[PDB]
Amino acid sequence: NQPVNQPILAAAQSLHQEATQWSSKGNDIIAAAKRMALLMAEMSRLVRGGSGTKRALIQCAKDIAKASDEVTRLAKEVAKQCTDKRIRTNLLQVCERIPTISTQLKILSTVKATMLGRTNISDEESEQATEMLVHNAQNLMQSVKETVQEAEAASIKIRTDAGFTLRWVQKTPWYQ
């Protein structure tokens, strides 16, 4: 079908597996994380494209960074209502890593996009730029996955408020 950068696809699938165990209904962290995983999977295809995929590669990074701001914004709200200082601090700590990682995703996607369909660039420049993009994508997927898990852990420490708190409902059994 279409060539894909396996480690980016694997990082995407890893976040999606974790996010899809929960319902998006009344959980915008879950919705944004699912959008991020789906967009990151598109990225693994685009990173392998020609000159025509240059705009799509940079727009994909921009979309991923926008979905990560929704994750960060909501996780800060979860933290603000959490009574456990350990969980509250962890959530606030990860919220400050995500914008840095996603800024770096935009810079490395632009770097890779300038290289698509070019003949003058060496395999070394290309490989080095691709490896940097790969690591950044893995770090981002990991940070959001951990943000999902900590936001769920924080829910136990929050007085459930219908229409006012995040909703955690398993869509499928954990062992499926």
Domain at 147, CATH number: 1.20.120.230
Q: How far apart are CA 127 and CA 109, in angstroms?
A: 13
When divided into structural domains, the chain yields a total of 1
Domain limits at 63?
1-176
Q: Residue 129 is inside which H or E element, if any?
A: helix 123-155
The SS3 assignment for 27 reads coil
Resolution (A): 2.8
Q: What is the b/e burial string over 58-95, where b = at least 16 CB atoms within 10 angstroms of the residue's CB? A: bebbbbbbebbebbbebbebbbebbeeeebbebbeebb
| Helix/strand number for the chain, H first, E second | 5, 0
CB 50 within 8 A of CB 11: no
**Short-list 2, 85, 91, CA closest to 42:** 2
